[PDB]
Enzyme design. Structure first.
Site, PDB file in Angstrom:
ATOM      1  N   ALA A  54      -8.137  14.990 -16.319  1.00 17.14           N
ATOM      2  CA  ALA A  54      -9.333  15.683 -16.770  1.00 17.14           C
ATOM      3  C   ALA A  54     -10.521  14.771 -16.481  1.00 17.14           C
ATOM      4  O   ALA A  54     -11.453  15.152 -15.773  1.00 17.14           O
ATOM      5  CB  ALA A  54      -9.242  15.971 -18.262  1.00 17.14           C
ATOM      6  N   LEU A  87       2.053 -27.810   3.993  1.00 17.25           N
ATOM      7  CA  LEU A  87       2.573 -28.864   3.132  1.00 17.25           C
ATOM      8  C   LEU A  87       3.550 -29.738   3.902  1.00 17.25           C
ATOM      9  O   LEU A  87       4.335 -29.240   4.711  1.00 17.25           O
ATOM     10  CB  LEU A  87       3.299 -28.255   1.931  1.00 17.25           C
ATOM     11  CG  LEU A  87       2.493 -27.680   0.767  1.00 17.25           C
ATOM     12  CD1 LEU A  87       3.427 -26.882  -0.114  1.00 17.25           C
ATOM     13  CD2 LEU A  87       1.838 -28.797  -0.035  1.00 17.25           C
ATOM     14  N   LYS A 134       9.933 -24.160  -4.812  1.00 14.06           N
ATOM     15  CA  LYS A 134       9.482 -23.684  -3.513  1.00 14.06           C
ATOM     16  C   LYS A 134       9.895 -22.232  -3.314  1.00 14.06           C
ATOM     17  O   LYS A 134      11.000 -21.954  -2.854  1.00 14.06           O
ATOM     18  CB  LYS A 134      10.097 -24.539  -2.410  1.00 14.06           C
ATOM     19  CG  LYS A 134       9.153 -25.566  -1.826  1.00 14.06           C
ATOM     20  CD  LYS A 134       9.502 -25.853  -0.376  1.00 14.06           C
ATOM     21  CE  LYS A 134       8.450 -25.295   0.564  1.00 14.06           C
ATOM     22  NZ  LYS A 134       8.145 -26.252   1.661  1.00 14.06           N
ATOM     23  N   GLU A 180       2.481 -16.844  -3.479  1.00 12.94           N
ATOM     24  CA  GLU A 180       3.484 -16.442  -2.488  1.00 12.94           C
ATOM     25  C   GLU A 180       4.245 -15.157  -2.802  1.00 12.94           C
ATOM     26  O   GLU A 180       5.294 -15.198  -3.439  1.00 12.94           O
ATOM     27  CB  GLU A 180       4.497 -17.570  -2.286  1.00 12.94           C
ATOM     28  CG  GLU A 180       5.103 -17.601  -0.900  1.00 12.94           C
ATOM     29  CD  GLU A 180       4.677 -18.813  -0.113  1.00 12.94           C
ATOM     30  OE1 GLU A 180       5.292 -19.087   0.936  1.00 12.94           O
ATOM     31  OE2 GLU A 180       3.726 -19.489  -0.546  1.00 12.94           O
ATOM     32  N   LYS A 240      12.653 -30.656   0.310  1.00 18.87           N
ATOM     33  CA  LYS A 240      13.344 -29.507   0.872  1.00 18.87           C
ATOM     34  C   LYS A 240      14.853 -29.721   0.915  1.00 18.87           C
ATOM     35  O   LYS A 240      15.345 -30.619   1.602  1.00 18.87           O
ATOM     36  CB  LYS A 240      12.813 -29.224   2.269  1.00 18.87           C
TER      37      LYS A 240
END
Length: 321
Positions: free
Chosen positions: A35, A85, A116, A177, A317
């Site tokens: 509406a 990085l 990560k 990310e 890593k």
């Protein structure tokens, strides 16, 4: 309520019409109630051409019918630089990776350890509590514009929620990310295999592809979970450290599931950067490693940032399998 005011109603209301259109339309999530919406344009319509010297193919009224809203990845510059990085495959590497602060810091400035989140990065520029644009990493200096698609994403709030000891910064360029939870991805795929497309190899793609849709509708249908992970250029904030910023982003509505661990000494992190291995699978996300970050901004400043990545945040890593 003269012309100067005319606008202070004209465009002043259009920005609300298309605002809901998009919402109702390609996104399928209405804020108001049919509406109401149907009551705005109706007002804007007649009282638009009521001022012919204020009507055009850009008018959300006599134009914004069904479509109109569509992504087209238009090359757009950024604001900071958005670098990558460094990386640490070997632990004894980390030693230096942060031990480089052995230079200026007194080996004490508080290192932040993060997860990560393997995925497709996006930058968000909140011009005055609202979302202005949304570019991709790109060449780092300038990226693609997936505003609509980004807007359609859940976790990304088109508007900032003021409050607390933090005032809505008149900009706040936040980095994050966007990704896909394993299952959500395993569903999207499963609900395909072909019959139009083909299964995605790895989620990084499932996401990217999803977010990289010209027709926001596709992107709006797809799940996707953004997680504003790093602050960028700002103008109305400027906090003392990374986390103190996180607490602020949270109070703002942005996603910050950085399983952080405000550490101290190479020991504090050596463990967390060794604990996320035999126990790094319970996550609904997809972390490939960890990344330490000098917490106190007051230190990253007195710390260079090469043309490839910062000099204050290595990224551990953990090698696949």
């Amino acid at each position: 309520q003269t012309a100067p005011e005319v606008l202070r109603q004209w465009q002043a209301l259009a920005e609300e019409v298309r605002e809901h259109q998009f919402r109702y339309y390609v996104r399928d999530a209405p804020i108001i109630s049919d509406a109401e919406f149907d009551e705005l344009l109706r007002r804007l319509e007649a009282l638009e051409e009521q001022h012919p010297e204020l009507r055009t193919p850009d008018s959300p009224t006599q134009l914004v019918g069904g479509a109109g809203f569509a992504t087209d990845f238009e090359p757009v510059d950024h604001l900071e630089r958005m670098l990558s990085l460094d990386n640490a495959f070997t632990a004894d590497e980390l030693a230096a990776w942060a031990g480089r602060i052995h230079a200026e810091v007194g080996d004490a400035a508080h290192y932040l350890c993060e997860l990560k989140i393997d995925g497709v990065a996006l930058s968000l520029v909140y011009r005055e509590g609202r979302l202005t644009r949304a570019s991709t990493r790109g060449d780092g200096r300038t990226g693609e514009d997936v505003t609509l698609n980004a807007r359609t994403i859940a976790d990304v709030p088109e508007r900032l929620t003021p409050g607390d000891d933090y005032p809505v910064p008149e900009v706040l360029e936040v980095r994050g990310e966007v990704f896909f939870r394993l299952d959500d991805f395993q569903a999207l795929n499963a609900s395909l295999v072909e019959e139009g497309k083909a299964p995605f190899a790895n989620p990084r793609n499932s996401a990217a592809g999803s977010l990289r849709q010209k027709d926001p509708a596709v992107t709006a249908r797809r799940r996707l979970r953004m997680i504003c992970h790093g602050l960028g250029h700002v103008e109305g904030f400027r906090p003392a450290t990374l986390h103190q910023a996180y607490l602020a982003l949270r109070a703002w509505g942005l996603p910050v599931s950085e399983h952080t661990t405000l550490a101290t000494d190479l020991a504090g992190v050596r463990e967390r950067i060794d604990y996320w291995g035999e126990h790094r699978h319970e996550v609904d996300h997809e972390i490939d490693g960890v990344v330490v970050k000098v917490d106190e901004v007051a230190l990253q400043r007195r710390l260079g940032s090469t043309s490839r990545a910062p000099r204050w945040a290595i990224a551990y890593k953990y090698p696949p399998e």
